[PDB]
């Protein structure tokens, strides 16, 4: 006879999630594996001869890249000699300045900094993260996608997402040939919601760079790196191809970050017996070594791998902390589904949301998850009211705000009408008034008329093959009754000429003002210091729907 108690438990959504006993020999362990190497470095005439156990004779491309470019060799011996527990204590001590720590962490080996953060619990790690975060002001990034690659819908969702507070928005494709339309729709809709929002369109590496070269994106993020050589190779790159790519983006004046995330190497079959966190630290140093300003990490798309094993969500916070601690912008995931349980996904999100990171999520879904083309985010559009309530409950600035239905409708409408004018002006397949209205009031692609994807893809294709660039979009808006929006598009294009937003954590706020770690220096020193939710921003967050005036 069964226990009715256990029968009710068996039905809970959390018991649909994938869980696994650790598999240490295959690296299916989130962190603190007995196979992880003891921190060590040896340097002879300015060149590393041993790194975290391995002699230089056995270095792979990743060891070479990190030993040569990823570590401050001038202080590496000194820092290796320091006590990892004291260093971990320094990270969460409110009276040890960020600027006092970064010289030490950037001289650590990958195994050393992992050893340091592994002495910490998540409360200590959050205490540390609010201080080590490079930008003083936390931010947020969203996905804007739909399962039809409907460009009218993407512009409308993008406008709403910018209005709600996202400072970066990211699209991708259900059907890859649609990409140039998605990109343009995202950029237009984003400038309508809030001039300054940065946009990316995540694709195969060469294809994405070319799109950027044509002017239809503001930055790139999914520039993937991996923590074992065989896995990196199946990722069709090396540290050197990926560092060249990084510099290629910058040579076009485009902001970019790498992406990594615990569990990729397990997922792709070669962990070389190491824990996920240790291999992710190699990814973080590859990023540093390449001279890339920032990193999207926190397992990201492989979140079902660390989440399956013990301490996987703690490991995810730890990798974020290592990223910030090594003085890189951290776009801290919270962008991918790993659970059927609302309780569980909330706990995973709060690790980053409570302290604040450069991007609390690197892909909150600003569409219902059925439309999310990265196969689901940890939050979606239906969670927006919950997110705002928790901001209010805890006095935490999560980057977003309550908004009025009538403002959202006006802004979605304007975005669709601007994009309609773009398609007409560029001679692309028409956007009808009926499609403008549906995009205005839509929740997702289920509310949208179907399009002729044959015509769209043919013209999307020709944007690429005929090298139709970003100024074509500016002219069509200007010529089509959308001069304001045209000006805003031109302005975000101009941002590519100064190099200013190429710096660590840069976003663009207010009237085209760059906001980065260079001019928005995090200055945390404990209670009542550093970034604090207050004043008008607090009033804004307080103002949720349903809050009746008691009198």
């Amino acid at each position: 006879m069964r226990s009715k108690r256990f029968e009710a438990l068996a039905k809970r959504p959390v018991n649909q999630d994938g869980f696994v006993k650790e598999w240490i020999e295959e690296g299916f362990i989130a962190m603190e594996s007995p196979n992880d190497p003891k921190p060590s470095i040896k340097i002879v005439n300015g060149a590393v001869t041993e790194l975290d156990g391995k002699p230089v004779s056995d270095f792979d491309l990743i060891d070479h890249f990190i030993a040569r470019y990823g570590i401050n060799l001038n202080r590496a011996e000194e820092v290796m000699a320091m006590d990892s527990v004291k260093l971990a204590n320094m990270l969460c001590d409110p009276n040890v300045k960020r600027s006092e720590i970064v010289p030490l962490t950037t001289a650590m080996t990958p195994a050393k900094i992992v050893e340091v953060v592994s002495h910490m619990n998540v409360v200590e790690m959050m205490m540390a993260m609010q201080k080590m975060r490079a930008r003083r002001t936390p931010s947020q990034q969203a996905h804007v996608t739909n399962v039809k690659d409907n460009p009218v819908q993407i512009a409308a969702d993008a406008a709403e997402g910018a209005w709600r507070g996202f400072d970066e928005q990211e699209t991708t494709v259900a059907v890859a040939r649609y990409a140039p339309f998605n990109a343009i729709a995202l950029l237009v809709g984003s400038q309508v919601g809030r001039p300054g929002v940065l946009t990316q369109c995540s694709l195969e590496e060469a294809t994405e760079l070319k799109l950027g070269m044509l002017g239809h994106t503001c930055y790139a993020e999914t520039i993937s790196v991996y923590g074992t050589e065989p896995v990196f190779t199946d990722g069709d790159d090396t540290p050197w191809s990926k560092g060249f790519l990084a510099s290629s983006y910058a040579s076009r004046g485009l902001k970019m970050r790498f992406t990594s995330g615990s569990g990729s190497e397990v997922q792709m079959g070669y962990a070389e017996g190491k824990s996920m966190l240790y291999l992710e630290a190699r990814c973080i140093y590859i990023t540093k070594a390449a001279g890339v300003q920032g990193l999207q990490n926190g397992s990201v798309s492989c979140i079902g791998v660390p989440s399956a094993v013990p301490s996987g969500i703690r490991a995810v916070l730890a990798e974020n902390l290592i990223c910030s601690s090594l003085d890189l912008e951290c776009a801290s995931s919270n962008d991918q589904t790993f659970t059927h349980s609302d309780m569980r996904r909330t706990a995973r999100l709060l690790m980053q949301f409570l302290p604040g990171t450069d991007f609390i999520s690197s892909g909150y879904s600003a569409v219902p998850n059925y439309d999310n083309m990265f196969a689901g985010s940890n939050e979606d559009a239906e969670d927006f009211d919950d997110y705002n309530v928790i901001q209010r409950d805890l006095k935490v600035d999560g980057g977003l705000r309550p908004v009025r239905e009538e403002d959202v409708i006006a802004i979605r409408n304007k975005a669709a009408r601007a994009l309609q004018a773009v398609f007409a002006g560029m001679g692309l397949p028409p956007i009808t008034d009926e499609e403008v209205e549906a995009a205005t009031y839509a929740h997702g692609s289920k509310d949208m008329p179907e399009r002729n994807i044959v015509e769209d893809i043919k013209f999307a294709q020709e944007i690429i093959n005929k090298n139709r660039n970003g100024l074509e979009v500016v002219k069509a808006l200007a010529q089509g009754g959308f001069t304001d929006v045209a000006q805003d598009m031109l302005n975000i294009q101009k941002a590519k000429l100064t190099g200013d937003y190429l710096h660590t954590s840069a976003i663009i706020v207010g009237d085209g003002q760059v906001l980065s770690a260079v001019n928005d220096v995090n200055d945390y020193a404990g209670p009542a210091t550093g970034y604090r939710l207050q004043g008008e921003r607090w009033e804004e967050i307080k103002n949720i729907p349903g809050a009746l005036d008691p009198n």
Partner: protein
């Protein structure tokens, strides 16, 4: 030499940033776009701007970021299709050693991209050792 006190350039020294072709930031107006007085070819960051940004990054305590910027400055002289060819050349199993060394010679002699040339010769040497050259898969 630019320092973080010089940042942001757009606010502190817009003049320092004058493009590909002697256009200034303020030359990029809707009117000038529309009359084609300015076009995509004018809208290109310069090696000077990127080297200034590299100095600011160094002043910010970010030497590898600076070095990235230094490589980018060199690459501004390389045309879009050549950029893509060289990126693809560096991907695993695409190239022979001699093909990488020739990209390196070409970077240096045609574009004076000496850092990037050095970068590519370093990859060739290590691509031999780690077997990521054409035929090694």
């Amino acid at each position: 030499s630019a320092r973080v006190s010089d940042y942001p350039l757009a606010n502190k020294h817009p003049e320092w940033v004058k493009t590909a072709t002697n256009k200034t930031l303020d030359d990029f107006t809707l009117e000038n776009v529309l009359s084609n007085k300015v076009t995509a070819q004018d809208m290109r960051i310069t090696p000077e701007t990127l080297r200034l940004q590299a100095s600011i990054a160094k002043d910010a305590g970010r030497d590898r970021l600076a070095m990235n910027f230094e490589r980018a400055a060199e690459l501004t002289a390389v045309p879009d299709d050549r950029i893509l060819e060289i990126y693809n050349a560096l991907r695993p199993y695409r190239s022979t050693k001699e093909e990488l060394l020739a990209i390196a010679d070409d970077l240096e002699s045609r574009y004076q991209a000496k850092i990037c040339a050095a970068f590519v010769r370093e990859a060739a040497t290590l691509y031999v050792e780690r077997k990521k050259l054409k035929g090694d898969d």
